[PDB]
Amino acid sequence: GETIDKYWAPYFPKPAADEAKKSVNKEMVGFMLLGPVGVAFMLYDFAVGLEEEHHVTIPPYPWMRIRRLPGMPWGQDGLFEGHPRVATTWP
Amino acid sequence: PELITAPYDPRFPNRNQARHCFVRFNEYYKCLYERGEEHPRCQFYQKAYQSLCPSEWVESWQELREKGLWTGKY
Amino acid sequence: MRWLYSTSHKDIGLLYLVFAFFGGLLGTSLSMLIRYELALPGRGLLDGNGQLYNVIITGHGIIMLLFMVMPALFGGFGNWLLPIMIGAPDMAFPRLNNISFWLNPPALALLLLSTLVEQGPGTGWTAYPPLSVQHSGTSVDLAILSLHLNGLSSILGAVNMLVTVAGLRAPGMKLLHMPLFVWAIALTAVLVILAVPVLAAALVMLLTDRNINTAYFCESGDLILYQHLFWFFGHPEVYILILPAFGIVSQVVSFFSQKPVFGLTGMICAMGAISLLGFIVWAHHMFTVGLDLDTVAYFTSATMIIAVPTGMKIFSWMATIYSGRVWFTTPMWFAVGFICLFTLGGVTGVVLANAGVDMLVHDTYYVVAHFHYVLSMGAVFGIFAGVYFWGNLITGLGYHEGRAMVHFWLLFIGVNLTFFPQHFLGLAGMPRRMFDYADCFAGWNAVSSFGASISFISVIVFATTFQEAVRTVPRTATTLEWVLLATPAHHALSQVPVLRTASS
Amino acid sequence: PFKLPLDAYILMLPITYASAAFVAMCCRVPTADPETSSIAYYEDEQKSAAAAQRYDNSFKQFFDARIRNHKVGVFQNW
Amino acid sequence: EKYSHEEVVYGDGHHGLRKGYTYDFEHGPHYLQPEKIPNFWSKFYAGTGALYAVGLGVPLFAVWWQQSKLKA
Amino acid sequence: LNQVWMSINREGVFYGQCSELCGANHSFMPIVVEAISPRQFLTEYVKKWIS
Amino acid sequence: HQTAKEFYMEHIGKRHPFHVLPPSPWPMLAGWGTYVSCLGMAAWFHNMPTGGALMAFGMANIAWTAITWWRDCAIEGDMGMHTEVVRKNFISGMWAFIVSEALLFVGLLWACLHLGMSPSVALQMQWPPVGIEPIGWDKRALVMSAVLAASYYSANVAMVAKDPKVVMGALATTIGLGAMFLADQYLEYNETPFTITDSPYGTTFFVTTGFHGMHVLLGSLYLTAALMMYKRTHNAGAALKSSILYWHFVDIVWIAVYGIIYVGQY
Amino acid sequence: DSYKATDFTNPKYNYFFRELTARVQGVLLTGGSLYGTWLVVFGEAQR
Amino acid sequence: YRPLGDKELWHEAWMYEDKFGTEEDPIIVPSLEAERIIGVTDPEDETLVVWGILKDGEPPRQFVENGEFYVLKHVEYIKKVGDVLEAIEG
């Protein structure tokens, strides 16, 4: 009950209850302007996720799949890369 | 006797002249596609890129053309 | 326990100073191999191993730039002196001040351990790709991780300094009554915060090029972008290392002239103008890389404007000594030697700032002579000026005056006869970072190698200057650290001093 | 923090000049010839030559008369 | 006791000489008292000699290490 | 592809080195330029490279 | 111990409003943990065995020491050691740290602007390179923009509110909207038709967005640690304000990242 | 009367967080540093 | 006292006094110990600062030329003026 924060408390006054609620309403107007619609579209996007497919193979251009060192520190393909898309045959 | 080299292209003003090399190399094959093979302008473009581009760059560009990895239309 | 778990700024500053002395010993040792290989044409003690020579110059340049000057000035004198000088009882974040130190022995250990791995990191202190990428193995990664840790140390220290200045000042003391050392340290902290993370970003790009097969500086990337980012860091870096030297020279010159500093607001505006212009002239290190003529034109015209505030500072130091009551001791000589020999290093920078002249002397020993003037006469003299000035306050030991003058004269003879012939070598066309040269360059290289031995012997004699101290009682001073006892207590400023304005 | 001394405005004139030159240099680069992400920019030879010659002439045309007069030095060394 | 929040916050209220110190550095008038360490000048010169030896001998060892690797 | 425009006033043999750090043998890449008259260049030297 | 608080009041507390710390062991352990994790990271780059394990061991040691340090800071904040001037010092320190991180992001986006605007002959002077399919702005990135703007406004709600329930709800809403940003970024990283080794476009995109996502994660963990301290005492002090400032900084960084990479195709 | 067992900053948890970790982590970093030094020095890179 | 507007409430005033210290009427500086460092500016130049040490039981002391005289007094509490006496507002 004799803490430093309480000891120096009267020398650092707070800068001066319904105005707080008015400010909360003012900020919540901008919150609800973009809040529910983004959550709704993101919850739609979580269910239209890894179901579509792409079969566009990419020719092995010199700027594609740089291998200045052999492989990667974790393995052969890239991280987070389920399906490589650059042609490994080329033809 | 007089020696003929690549002329100054106003389109390429910087000290790095790699783009002048590339555009002349591409204008040669565009001339070859459009205006025949023995047109004087195509020979002008050929001597123009041969005068600017290093031989290693050119041979890398024909191996990319032969492998099919050239992004030009023609 | 005391030196491992400390939260006091005075113990941490002393630890920084001892660390910086160790780094200076390492870079002195690495520099006798450079001068002992270069003494004669042909092959010396390195047996013609060029990769080992590149490793030696890279490690030596990095060590002397980052583990000697910055831990001595910014970390050593700033941490010990700033809270006493502004009247703060401690730092704003006392445990952040201990991690700002303790990230430096890991970085030094990584840098020294990269030399024993594979063939070492022979790239230069700038570490340009694709030479840094082409190095196979582990050494370059250890070197860049060492630079990352040292940059984190610097950023944490700068944050702690900037908050300690702004919020723990003595009552009544505004931003008009702080000494110029405090102003220099604050501006150095601002420069560190604005400049070091760009280097960190460039180094992360270098690791992703080396180990993740990315395309930053590569076949399909742009290698000039590395030089842009690195020198956008690196030109603020050399001003980070010289501003605390300016502050120490101001405090030393004002002390023994029995006078205040001439033009205090002009001094502060000059340091601010130096700090601001250091962020828009970085590309004078890139005149020969093939930039457009307009860019080179701007970077030529803007670099020479840095001459005006530095000249104002030098002339104000001369005006401070002017019309005073001057007593010449060992710190006063190191300041007079600073002002004399920093001017010699600064005027060659104006020559280098002109781009057409720089086409002849780029990557020659002319540049080496320039930056060993502004760093071995600018920062080393400033460091040694503070060691003899505040030494009995910091360490509790006095120094023998005769041996200190012997050390000053041996150093002054050694470093002048080392880097002055390198101007003539660089004008003639001797290139940098080479261990074998043409037969005609033998004479000035022999002279410079003779001078480096005198510099080494001067380093040896410095360890003999220390002796027992005499303690007296203070009454008055013009700065707060001279009314304290030698040594002060663990909690210096047991009561917080206040500044009272005179009444009517 | 203090009263700016009569020096500091004389410092601030070339400092403002250097800042304006830096801003103009950074601004004119995305209006230059090699900053085009296409090959079809160069197939219009009239516009590309006009743009690149305009990139040459500005900030160099101030110096053409003294380049022709060899005013390359402060003194006159023949 | 011995692990309370007050021990964390205000430290441990130790008074006097700590363990092997001959002077009180925490609460005495001087935080460094180099005239009270017994045999101080022997230890100072031994430590300075060790610092000089290591700081001048680490690059020599790194030169000898890299050249012993080639000569094999 | 960095371009340089150069015109030499007098004949002679001019020396140089490489001025960017590039490895262990950075010291040992010198440059020598031999300058001759244009009529000699266009009547004798270029006849060495006609196939 | 009982007189140690008495000694602190008599000699430090009653003289000035600033906090003086006892000796601490965590900076030394954090420094040597950085050393161990750097050795591990160097071994893990060049595919040495037991190198990734060493790097994870060092990073776990760093994280544990950082959590112990921050628990000590929260303990000292709950025994009333920090006055109002100490809390303003905390806010100023966070401002300086934010300026450092902003310059790091400026350096990161410098490379994106440089590489994207002038494609080299190695890319056959086409940006974006042929084969690379750019991620558009009229798709899931716009949903991320709306979500993160909502998180900005909800963190702005919690700064001015005085009801503890509204503050806790606004903090939880901002934390949950931040976690929805990351789980959607994971889906972008998995569905994208380019990798980090595919052109400077892929390199710059993945490095910049990865740094931004790691900052989103760190800000969300900071806001979460600020909420649990408000849950116990209904008083957070500097932990709430600094975390809201850091979250606003992340929201400001996202504006530049989106406008440069997703809109500008750089 | 202001501390629960669920509370992270409980005074009964101070020995585990502050005293045991100070020596356990102190020996773990020594062991990790020696092994990392030997691994980087005397190890062969496979990539 | 001087006007306490734009002053921090914890600054321990006496430094905000309306009195010029003379030899016959000095300024009494409170102290928690037997000695205390204070700082006096030069009356003809604000940029010049002199720090001195006052001792208990000593004659009045001047620090700068044509400046105030000061006497130290050892007290148990120093009035943190800004909430100590302007809250009293007597």
Ligand code: HEA
């Ligand atoms: C702080 C910077 C600093 C200092 C002091 C020095 C000091 C010296 N340096 Fe060097 N040097 C560099 C920075 C420095 N150098 C850099 C950045 C490079 C570039 C490397 C590269 O290109 O990659 C370089 C490279 C370099 C070269 C060029 C090599 C080449 O191009 O191949 C040469 C040539 O002679 C040289 C020699 C010397 C000599 C003889 C000294 C002598 O002065 C010896 C030192 C003597 C001293 C007295 C200074 C030591 C200071 C202390 C001991 C004070 C500390 C004390 C306390 C804290 C109490 N060093």
Ligand code: HEA
């Ligand atoms: C202490 C560090 C330090 C300091 C303070 C400086 C200060 C300056 N430097 Fe330098 N510099 C370096 C460290 C430093 N430098 C390093 C380490 C390198 C090499 C980097 C590498 O490793 O590659 C380098 C290289 C370097 C280059 C790159 C050239 C090249 O390598 O090819 C340039 C170009 O402009 C330059 C110029 C200047 C100028 C104009 C100043 C000015 O600030 C100096 C201004 C001072 C004066 C001019 C003297 C005082 C003024 C007067 C007495 C008034 C009268 C003057 C006039 C009327 C003109 N220096």
Ligand SMILES: [Cu+2]
């Ligand atoms: Cu520079």
Ligand SMILES: [Mg+2]
């Ligand atoms: Mg160079």
